[PDB]
Amino acid sequence: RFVELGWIDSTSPVNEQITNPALVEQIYHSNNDQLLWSDLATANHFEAQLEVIHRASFSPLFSRQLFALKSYRQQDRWHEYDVLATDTLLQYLSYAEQAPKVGIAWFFEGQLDQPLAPPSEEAQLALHMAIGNQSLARLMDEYTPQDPAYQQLLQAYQSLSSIEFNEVALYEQMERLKRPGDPLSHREALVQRLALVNLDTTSILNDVAYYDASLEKPIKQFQKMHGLQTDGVIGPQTMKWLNTSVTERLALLALNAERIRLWPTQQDSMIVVNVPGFDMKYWDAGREVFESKVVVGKTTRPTPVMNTKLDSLIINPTWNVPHKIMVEDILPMVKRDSEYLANHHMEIIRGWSDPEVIDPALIDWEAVEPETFPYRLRQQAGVQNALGTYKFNTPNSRAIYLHDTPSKHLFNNASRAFSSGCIRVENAEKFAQTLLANQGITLDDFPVSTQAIALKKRIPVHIIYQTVWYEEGVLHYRDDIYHYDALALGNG
């Protein structure tokens, strides 16, 4: 298959690189077979967009086409460049349209490594019009999220890009922890690395030999920006981020900017949990009506990025221990600690369909193998239940949901990856009250027995993974707990 254009030989390598020759030739024929990319500023603008996608590292497709474009350009093969650019712009338009629909597959469950379906007729009309007006640069901009949050990441990207290769000494210290009052060997590298993330360094005193008062606010601001405990102590967590290179920050800005294409913005009614920020928000009628900290899955039992809906609440839930938890976690402890089941208010039941309670005294524990244990565990409802007082049921293929917790001290931690995958909600009682108020449900008598409550209006729940974002006028960075930034960072 060869692109039917006079000024492209059938033997040209672009015939193997073009994903949609039929549509590309029609666009040219509709435009009198004129070149679309003869304005270098327009070529530059599209390569700069592809360079963001390339650095983000989620798309072998776009990386492959960018490398081919740059090669044709280095050789002044502008006719080939022209047709490959036009093909690649159709892929970009499809990417822009498809990201919010299926993009999880490109960022979290795989990569964008195969060509996409052609963009919509609306995109194809906007392209035809843009070609007529030589407004391709504006078209590309219109197919970015029209969202100040996205533009804040791209603005920082553009600032840092201009100083990417300036030498900045690493911050070094002799001891593991440096506290206010301690001598400092590397004050200048420290102040330069605070300045790199746009913190006000103008009141830091020059040539002071120790961690003085003038450094304390900037250090705590740096800690807060990176989600660290704001203890003022320059330890390994603080230094990891101080010593992050501009190249690595640019990778994080690019990947996080492109991830914004995935996430819904409608505030009709939505719940969003950002895993690596360990927080959540609930919007009703276009307003934030609830926010709280959360606990999320341990790195070995990760909370998946997913879309689901909140179908129902259980007030005073029991906990039906999943088979895998029973076998791997609990029964080994039961075998070694004859007070475990009483202490955790856990009953042995014949099965879910047959909740006959069996006294653990009636079982020969010596003979029990967790793997073959034929009964099930059910934790009684109450304030010490692992689900607390509230289960927020969000049915999905990974069996993830939201719940209250008796372990509320964990919300005081800066890093909150403690669960088996589920999301534990701080102020769960307030979340339930707000949900049920908005649904036109309220209990005149608060049950002290288990009660399942169907939502009348199902609420979309978006579990997202955003390690850089803009909020209250500043950028926030978070540790890549599930290693989804790892390929972009280059850190193996």
Ligand X SMILES: *C(=O)[C@H](CCC[C@H](N)C(=O)O)NC(=O)CC[C@@H](N)C(=O)O
Chain residues that interact with ligand X, rule: CB under 6 A: 322, 324, 386, 399, 419-422, 424
CA distance linking residue 13 with residue 373, whole number of Å = 63
- Smallest gap from residue 292 Cβ to ligand X (A): 15
Residue 457: other Cβ atoms inside 10 A: 12
* 3-class DSSP string for 393-432: ECCCCCCCCEECCCCHHHHHCCCCEEECCCEEECCHHHHH
CA distance linking residue 93 with residue 116, whole number of Å = 10
CB-nearer residue toward ligand X: 283 or 319: 319
DSSP run (H or E) holding 459: strand 451-464
CB-nearer residue toward ligand X: 83 or 326: 326
For residues 274 and 466, the answer to whether their CB atoms sit within 8 Å is: yes
For residues 376 and 308, the answer to whether their CB atoms sit within 8 Å is: no
- Smallest gap from residue 454 Cβ to ligand X (A): 21
- Smallest gap from residue 319 Cβ to ligand X (A): 6
CB-nearer residue toward ligand X: 264 or 421: 421
CB-nearer residue toward ligand X: 57 or 420: 420
CB-nearer residue toward ligand X: 385 or 438: 385
For residues 278 and 228, the answer to whether their CB atoms sit within 8 Å is: no
- Smallest gap from residue 392 Cβ to ligand X (A): 12
| Dihedral, CA of residue 148, residue 149, residue 152 and residue 153, to nearest 10 | -140
Instruction: Please give the residue whose beta carbon sits closest to ligand X in the complex.
Output: 422
For residue 159 the two structure tokens come to 């600032």
- Smallest gap from residue 399 Cβ to ligand X (A): 4
CB-nearer residue toward ligand X: 64 or 301: 301
CA distance linking residue 102 with residue 9, whole number of Å = 36
- Smallest gap from residue 432 Cβ to ligand X (A): 17
Burial of 245 from C-beta contacts in 10 A (0-12 / 13-18 / 19+) = middle
User: Looking at this protein, which amino acid is placed at residue 138?
Assistant: R
- Smallest gap from residue 421 Cβ to ligand X (A): 4
| Dihedral, CA of residue 112, residue 117, residue 122 and residue 127, to nearest 10 | 70
CB-nearer residue toward ligand X: 84 or 377: 377
CB-nearer residue toward ligand X: 377 or 422: 422
CB-nearer residue toward ligand X: 391 or 476: 391
- Smallest gap from residue 427 Cβ to ligand X (A): 16
User: Looking at this protein, which amino acid is placed at residue 374?
Assistant: P
CA distance linking residue 259 with residue 100, whole number of Å = 9
- Smallest gap from residue 34 Cβ to ligand X (A): 58
CB-nearer residue toward ligand X: 250 or 294: 294
User: Looking at this protein, which amino acid is placed at residue 66?
Assistant: L
Query: Which of 304, 242, 299 lies closest to 273, judged by CA?
Result: 304
Query: Which of 409, 412, 473, 464 lies closest to 221, judged by CA?
Result: 473
- Smallest gap from residue 354 Cβ to ligand X (A): 19
Query: Which of 374, 335, 325, 330 lies closest to 352, judged by CA?
Result: 374
